[PDB]
Design an enzyme around this catalytic site. Structure first.
Site, PDB file in Angstrom:
ATOM      1  CG  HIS A 120      -2.854   0.269   7.696  1.00 20.05           C
ATOM      2  ND1 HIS A 120      -2.630  -0.416   6.522  1.00 20.05           N
ATOM      3  CD2 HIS A 120      -3.779  -0.432   8.386  1.00 20.05           C
ATOM      4  CE1 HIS A 120      -3.396  -1.490   6.513  1.00 20.05           C
ATOM      5  NE2 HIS A 120      -4.097  -1.521   7.631  1.00 20.05           N
ATOM      6  CD  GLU A 142      -1.082  -0.327   3.740  1.00 19.65           C
ATOM      7  OE1 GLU A 142      -1.897  -1.261   3.665  1.00 19.65           O
ATOM      8  OE2 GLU A 142      -1.001   0.401   4.745  1.00 19.65           O
TER       9      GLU A 142
END
Ligand SMILES: Nc1nc2c(ncn2[C@@H]2O[C@H](COP(=O)(O)OP(=O)(O)OP(=O)(O)O)[C@@H](O)[C@H]2O)c(=O)[nH]1
Ligand SMILES: Nc1nc2c(ncn2[C@@H]2O[C@H](COP(=O)(O)OP(=O)(O)OP(=O)(O)O)[C@@H](O)[C@H]2O)c(=O)[nH]1
Ligand SMILES: [K+]
Ligand SMILES: [Mg+2]
Lengths: 305, 393
Positions: A258, A216
């Protein structure tokens, strides 16, 4: 040094696990589950309860104790954020070969200090923090991933996410391929195990014939992984590697859930990560729904099916 | 988390870092009076918003530039009047800019030299890194691109702390001469120490300047605070407004929902950050425009589901909702029941596509089915995507 402890990542049927913060809500809930999956959860620790039992397992005051008494080679931590770093340090002190810290929320500066500690020793391998853990399907599950979707198989999976990893595991079982070992390294910017650490294990594991790397935005671990695969996964016997990098539509400057998923100062964008991996021969699934079918096609093209 | 410039400058000031004297104002008159109080040769007026690039931004009031120098307190008032209450757009905000509610009225100083200085937990080398350049006043990225050579770094050992030699070295590399090197090194040390004290992931000073009078001053600062450290930075996080937050985002947060607005009409909510990002991505890949990113977290409560729904339907821009949940801890059924329940309590008005997978999935699907609600249940994420996009065409 620390790279030496990379082997501790490959948990198996012989891995004996102890839960730190054993009597806590999280430790208790995931411990019951580890038990049912068949993890060799052999006890836990919590200060002041040495000599007691919890969930029918021995409790020890310190990790030191638990380890010495049970022969535990792995530890898992679900402790709350303010105390998780000290738990990691305790496991590193007790020299637990493998420590998995599930806990999300640890201050980055605490992890920077834990990393300082970790890199100057070779006994303890840390997976995490902020991660789902690791699983050798049918052999050992340490963490919070749903055991049932995993099927022992041929794909090594390393991922910075939790549930997106589950999609990938599920996809691979729906196409009938299975996983050799799945390692969630977590969504935090500073952690104990990166992509390369896992790729190294995957590349040299005969049981891993293909790899899925889920990444990511944020950081440059994907880029480092690409560099690594370009050098180590080239050649007649290279293993197919398939990847999906989340955040192609993420806006710059925003933490995307996150703690480590942020494009900042122009760095960490998804496209560059995909491009880098592609140059390393990684087949990138543009769709997160097609990891299983993409890796399956790769096995197929190589008549590995 | 980021605080306003005036809050960051006070923290630095409180920690021995040199900054410009300033007062904060929430009205044009207050800015005028603060300017008089500064009794300075020249005053800098700066709109206070979190996004950088204020200097070249434009206000919805027509005023160009979010940072102004003037020697006249009355001009400060006139400029301020075109700032307070208006939106300031910069290359870092969306086009409709951000509302400015406060302005800083500070004492302008002459800048003899501008350098770039930052401290960050570097993800490339797992530790705090001092990053500096004698080419200040510019975007560091550009300097990196144009003159990587002008970029200097000192990796700091977290346990040891910054060493005199590193500070002195960086002071030299920034171009401070002998008599000022020491002053600069000292500031660098204080900045590093402040960086640590406050759990910053980044303290950026640009320009980290020199005045003709021989003062080493942090003219502008951006501090990124580690959200994970709020429990031990109570007083710092108390200063965070959340006032620049898109309202939907603040409501969501109240319920441990991480929302990030995007520009589109297909709303979605997923459990888990990677999946949530992947969900906006697959919508886009299938010709749709995701309206937002929303991560439910790891413990889905029918409450959350409900609020998520309330909040997304709140937004008129939303023409469809894609729910993508992969059940494990909280089995899918409890989830389907939350989906249905919220559907009934909110009388959803846009089409809904739901994709559940994982634990106790079968039961959950029967829930959706037996619900009789116009809920399209997708085979997988791709399907969920094409169908959700189809819903708004
Ligand atoms: N002489 C002088 N110029 C100043 C002072 N403060 C700001 N400036 C200048 O005002 C102009 C715009 O301010 P900057 O800080 O560069 O604007 P910016 O980079 O968009 O600011 P951010 O929004 O924080 O990113 C620049 O030419 C600055 O050098 C000061 O005290 N003295
Ligand atoms: N994006 C954008 N920037 C603008 C606009 N108008 C002015 N600016 C910028 O806002 C800052 C202050 O603008 P002005 O007060 O007009 O100053 P200036 O030195 O004449 O700026 P220039 O118009 O670039 O020559 C400068 O950095 C300008 O480039 C506009 O319509 N759009
Ligand atoms: K600046
Ligand atoms: Mg102009």
């Amino acid at each position: 040094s620390y790279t030496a402890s990379r082997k501790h990542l490959y948990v198996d049927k012989n891995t004996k696990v102890i839960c730190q913060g054993f009597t806590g809500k999280q430790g208790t809930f995931h411990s019951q589950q580890a038990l049912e999956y068949g993890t060799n959860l052999v006890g836990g620790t919590t200060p002041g309860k040495g000599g007691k039992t919890h969930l029918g397992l021995p409790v020890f005051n310190t990790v030191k104790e638990a380890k010495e008494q049970t022969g535990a080679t792995a530890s898992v931590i679900y402790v709350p954020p303010p105390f998780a770093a000290a738990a990691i340090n305790e496991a590193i002190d007790a020299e637990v070969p493998l420590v998995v810290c599930i806990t999300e929320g640890i201050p980055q500066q605490d992890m920077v200090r834990v990393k300082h500690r970790l890199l100057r020793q070779g006994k303890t391998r840390l997976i995490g923090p902020n991660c789902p853990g690791v699983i050798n399907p049918g052999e050992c599950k340490i963490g919070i991933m749903p055991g049932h979707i995993h099927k022992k198989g041929r794909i090594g999976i390393v991922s910075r996410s939790g549930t997106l990893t589950y999609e990938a595991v599920h996809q691979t079982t729906q196409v009938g391929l299975g996983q050799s070992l799945c390692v969630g390294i977590g969504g935090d910017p500073f952690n104990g195990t990166d992509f390369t650490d896992c790729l190294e294990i995957f590349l040299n594991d005969p049981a891993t014939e293909g790899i899925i790397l889920i990444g990511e935005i944020g950081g440059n671990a994907e880029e480092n992984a690409a560099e690594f695969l370009k050098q180590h996964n080239s050649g007649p016997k290279s293993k197919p590697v398939v990847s999906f990098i989340a955040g192609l539509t993420a806006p710059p400057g925003r933490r995307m859930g996150h703690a480590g998923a942020i494009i900042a100062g122009g760095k960490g964008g998804a496209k560059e990560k995909i491009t880098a991996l592609q140059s390393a021969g990684v087949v990138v699934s543009m769709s997160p729904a097609q990891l299983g079918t993409t890796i399956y096609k790769e096995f197929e093209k190589r008549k590995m099916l | 988390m980021n605080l306003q410039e005036y809050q960051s400058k006070k923290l630095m000031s409180d920690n021995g870092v040199k900054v410009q004297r300033f007062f904060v104002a929430d009205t044009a008159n207050e800015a005028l009076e603060a300017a008089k109080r500064l009794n300075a040769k020249e005053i800098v007026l700066k709109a206070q918003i979190l996004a950088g690039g204020r200097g070249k931004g434009v206000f919805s009031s027509g005023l160009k530039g979010g940072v102004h120098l003037t020697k006249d307190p009355e001009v400060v008032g006139q400029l301020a009047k075109q700032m307070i209450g208006y939106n300031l757009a910069t290359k870092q905000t969306p086009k409709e800019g951000v509302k400015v509610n406060k302005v800083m009225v500070a004492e302008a100083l002459d800048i003899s030299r501008e350098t770039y200085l930052a401290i960050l937990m570097d993800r490339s080398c797992n530790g705090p890194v001092l990053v500096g350049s004698p080419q200040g006043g510019v975007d560091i990225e550009e300097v990196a691109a144009s003159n990587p050579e002008l970029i200097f770094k000192e990796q700091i050992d977290i346990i040891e702390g910054i060493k005199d030699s590193q500070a002195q070295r960086m002071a030299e590399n920034l171009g401070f001469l002998g008599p000022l090197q020491n002053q600069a090194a000292d500031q660098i040390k204080k900045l590093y120490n402040l960086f640590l004290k406050i759990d910053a992931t980044q303290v950026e000073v640009n320009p980290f300047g020199e005045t003709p009078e021989g003062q080493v001053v942090c003219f502008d600062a951006k501090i990124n605070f580690d959200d994970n450290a709020e429990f031990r930075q109570k007083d710092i996080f108390a200063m965070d407004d959340k006032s620049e937050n898109e309202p939907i985002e603040n409501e969501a947060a109240k319920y441990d929902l991480k929302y990030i607005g995007l520009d589109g009409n297909i709303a979605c909510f997923v459990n888990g950050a990677g999946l949530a990002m992947a969900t906006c991505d697959i919508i886009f890949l299938n010709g749709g425009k995701p309206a937002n990113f929303l991560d439910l977290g790891g413990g889905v409560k029918e409450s959350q589901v409900y609020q998520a729904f309330k909040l997304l339907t709140a937004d008129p821009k939303v023409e469809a909702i894609l729910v993508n949940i992969f059940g494990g801890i909280v089995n899918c059924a409890i989830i389907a029941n939350g989906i249905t329940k919220a559907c009934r309590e909110l009388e959803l008005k846009v089409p809904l596509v739901v994709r559940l997978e994982g634990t106790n999935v079968h039961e959950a699907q029967n829930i959706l089915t037996n619900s009789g609600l116009p809920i399209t249940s997708a085979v997988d994420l791709e399907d969920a995507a094409k169908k959700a996009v189809a819903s708004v065409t």
